[PDB]
Symmetry: D2
Subunit: 359 residues, 4 copies
């Protein structure tokens, strides 16, 4: 213990802990809202299974900085599930795509996401057009880097389907069911592996599906909205609009509690509120009106270890100065000679360091 | 601090929202200074420019930069004009976050985006933005049901990437000019903002080129890519020696090249960015610049701020809220619902669970 | 609003806001425990009144970094009140003393603190021996800088006194009353000024005095201990020792609620617990069992604005890279030491030329 | 592997890494100035040797938050060496003393420091009067916790002695030599163990002793002052006083260069400056005028691993929300011989809280 490693550490240092064969690790890489802030990236979850499979559920704007702090090689993070096509649920897919490829991902991204009520409201269309949006980046990068990693294979599934299997691979099952939020399309996921069940709610008004299909989850994640008082205080909403937000549009803390009392998970996770010194306590208290079981109030870099005997909540202590960590056909140039003729002579300036570096 | 009860003047840090901008002043905040690889210390390239006439502009809005921009306490409606140097993810990735975020938070005007063409339609900004709006069609259509759709538009102003120091923007005595960069493939540009005797230059991404030294000449603030050392490229990224040497000569502007460029420009103040600014990277990069450039220099990091006045170009750090909220500034019900009855029929009765707080709140 | 200042800002930027003549600002500069943490300095409060007076109540180990982030000239913070002589309540007095002096505090520090049951248990004895403890620092610094600011004038008051005035100047009154904690000496304070009453509880097991003398405070601060469950989980304590800690030694969250139910303050402040993602919630719940009124769960750099109409909680956003801000004898060397100098003219010659021109 | 630990990590996670039997780890738990700042605690160094020994060299105001972030049990950090009796070099000794003792530390603290030109300018007096300063804390704590860990045993050494052994145990040698700062007493240390030599400069204007006794250290830590231009911009100082600060009083970046040129250490560490985005660069340029060897510009939580083949600089990434971590410890009972420090006058004031605490109290006993 003098020279040796401190065991069972009270914080999670990403890349410092072996994952056991009968264990799951879940890390919140975004817990926040459609509005950006350094304290909270938009919705993103990393799941690491003891079998060695790793999934991303949601990759909202700003979450890539949290994901990259985990010291996980890009080739282990190629399978992404989207609950919804909000920018705060998949905005950083383009950063995973582009950054991973420049940083040695060799395999394409695999993306599972819902359909909508028509083609242009679904995940296939969305990813297809994101790729065209970044055509300049794709074509220029593809000149100097083999484009195989630049492909995104989309597995779109019917948003309407009630607890149907959307993924079955290597003893891992993902089921989806609908959400009620903004318009048709958003879903929740249940990940089933090795007698474990992890539920990723996504975004919804309270629904009849989640309480049924999430039942007995080892870890149950659901949206848990800021209070009507907080909507008045913070967003300057009139009393009636603030009231409606927690009845019509979203799952209230009180509703979240009803739902988790119905679900009886080993551990419930509230997320998708601004987790501030002046907001969290009314939200936690709303939940405890109706649910008394183990509860985590999520913020960025919270981590859950799921074992047979426990679901433990810790905070990740991860590097702000993050770096990519290493894992184990002719194309047309996109330059004209008009541009390449612009090169400045810098032979003189670079001479000293160049002679020293080659020696 | 002249009084116990009163405001400390000329504060050594910049608190966003706490300072009046003078009529002959420019404020520039680095909202991202980093790389195509994400990290909490450094968002990807983003700049906020505030002029004394009340005009504000974003130059680049790379992945991760929106949290920094939101920490500035500037109403969404004042940040509608966005200039892109390149169509890399790490230069316009967070354009979508600004578009959706500000629209939810009460922006009332459409976004306005100036970006370069490419060699053909599908390599320029008009095509890029059109397809980004299609990519987020679900979010657009669902949000347009409950929020007026007008601020969900993006007006694109595409300009010729080939043009040598020509105007791309002219409004209210503010000029932006572009000239080309040499980077990845045709399209990327540098910008010069001219207003009220001032010239601010946003370099973007380039191998050393003949245009910047001429067109950036005498800028109040000159920003230019300044790459990590070949030795770092080896130490960090385990690059095989020759690759590491070619990166700092052919692909990017080395610190030494940046020095030559800024010695030619003779700016009032020069800014190196686009490297990982760490306790074991920054010093050799600095030394590299000083080989050739002796003038005023900032080694940019996130939330660094420059005040440009007639007498000085000041560098300070911004001290800004991590727990940021949108700040308020000064609905077409003839839209088809994007719900079907099938999904609406799924609602859980939660009347009991919510009655307690619901009674109380209606007092 | 484009060119202009953002009004009524949602965070407090220290040095950015004028205090009105009927306003109080209280900043928690330390909310923690006798064990150190970058997240929570030990007990320290800065109070700013609209009449321009400023006070420090407690200055525990680690709090000086928070106090220095406030951009307050050292000469404005010369008056310090100590609730108790725990290192986690006055450990940073020496940092304020030495730091302020080198940074151009011109006036001596003034310290109000309790006596104990005998001379060697009181503030007078403590500060006299603190200055001897740092006599090398004192003597060497005094050679180069005038020693007036290096004086500490101690105002020891009787710990036993029941709600008596220990300070009265410029319309500001502090009263003390005793606490029940560790041993005889610890006290709570009440600052009264311009119809406002701010209570600094210090450290206590629940006592009959605080509920009486704190009644109707604008801001009531009281110890609010971590739970007997948190005591076993975090300190591997035996169940019965973990039970006693929250009944005999300290104020339980539940006791805190009872006390604040009795006090009926405009705003209650719970502090002196580790404010963590897995501790804070049970502490809040315990309080809410008995207290329903406005409550803050304190952490470092929380700030309250006390006005006629409101008591507001905000977080302060302050510089980590802090600098002192300007407000408006025989050598201790022997020749044997001054002889050891290394010549460095050559090495320093280049810059010495540039600088002088 | 997807399942395994990432090896040779680019940041140090305190408590995550086994220390090699022929390895030294040095952590800057404080690198700053007489004035306080969240970014930089005052001068403090933690040194872990492969043999299991650990030492603290300096424990300035603010450093204890950093030291506690290391997940080291209190019982392993009972040996402290002071280079000077400045508040910003030993201010947090008291925090260590009180906090460890409450945390469950069972060994007294052991303090090594310099004498001065007379009794009341040396460490023995300083620590004696520090214990008297905290007499209320001592006597109240000694009622409920065993008093033996509350002792501080002082080993005062002669400040004038040129490179003499002030500590010698378990194959570890500490030597001291003088410095030229503020007045007589402040020293530098050299820690020698298993063919390694680590030097803690302390504070000094440039001296003849450092370059001689520091020669060929694996890690050489020396004061390296902010620039005279920086003294003018920051502290509004006049030109001549600004100039004098870097010549008369402190080691300029340029002098630091000369000294490390002369010492030729494996790795040089510059510290004791405010490490800001607008100060660090000129200070680095200053050192490079005369020193070309491996250099760290120190800031808080910077860590050096010293091995036969390399000296590696990493940043430690450590918990802000720190907790004491348990290690080996005695279950020493409180001394019932000790008088209570309560009088019946104070005890008579207890409020009845039976009711408010009965709900959670019952449930807790179930
Ligand atoms: Zn959402
Ligand atoms: Zn770039
Ligand atoms: Zn206390
Ligand atoms: Zn010092």
């Amino acid at each position: 213990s003098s020279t040796g490693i401190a065991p069972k550490r009270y914080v999670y240092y990403p890349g410092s802990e072996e994952l056991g064969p009968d264990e799951i690790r879940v890390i919140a890489c975004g817990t926040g809202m459609p509005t950006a802030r350094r304290a909270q990236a938009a919705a993103a979850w990393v799941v690491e299974l003891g079998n060695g499979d790793k999934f991303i559920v949601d990759i909202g704007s700003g979450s890539m900085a949290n994901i990259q702090s985990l010291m996980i090689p890009a080739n282990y993070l190629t399978k992404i599930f989207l609950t919804a096509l909000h920018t705060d649920h998949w905005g950083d897919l383009v950063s995973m795509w582009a950054g991973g490829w420049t940083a040695g991902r060799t395999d394409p991204l695999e993306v599972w996401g819902p359909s909508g009520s028509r083609e242009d409201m679904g995940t296939k269309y969305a990813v297809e057009h994101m790729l065209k949006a970044y055509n300049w980046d794709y074509m220029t990068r593809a000149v100097t880097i083999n484009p195989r990693p630049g492909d995104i294979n989309v597995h779109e599934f019917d948003y309407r389907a009630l607890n149907e299997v959307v993924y079955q691979e290597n003893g891992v099952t993902f089921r989806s069911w609908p959400c009620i939020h903004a318009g048709d399309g958003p879903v929740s996921f249940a990940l089933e592996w090795n007698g474990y069940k992890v539920v990723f709610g996504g975004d919804t008004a309270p629904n009849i599906w989640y309480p049924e299909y999430a039942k007995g989850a080892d870890l149950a994640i659901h949206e848990c909205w800021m209070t009507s008082d907080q909507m008045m205080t913070k967003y300057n909403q009139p009393a009636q609009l603030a009231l409606r937000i927690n009845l019509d549009f979203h799952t209230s803390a009180q509703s979240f509690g009803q739902i988790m009392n119905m679900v009886q998970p080993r551990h419930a996770v509230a997320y998708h509120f601004f987790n501030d010194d002046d907001t969290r306590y009314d939200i936690y208290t709303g939940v405890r009106e109706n649910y008394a079981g183990p509860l985590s109030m999520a913020t960025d870099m919270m981590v859950w270890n799921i074992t047979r005997d426990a679901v433990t909540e810790r905070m990740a202590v991860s590097p702000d100065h993050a770096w990519d960590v290493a894992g184990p056909r002719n194309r047309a140039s996109e330059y004209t000679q008009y541009i390449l003729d612009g090169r400045l002579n810098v032979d003189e300036a670079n001479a000293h360091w160049k002679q020293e570096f080659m020696g």
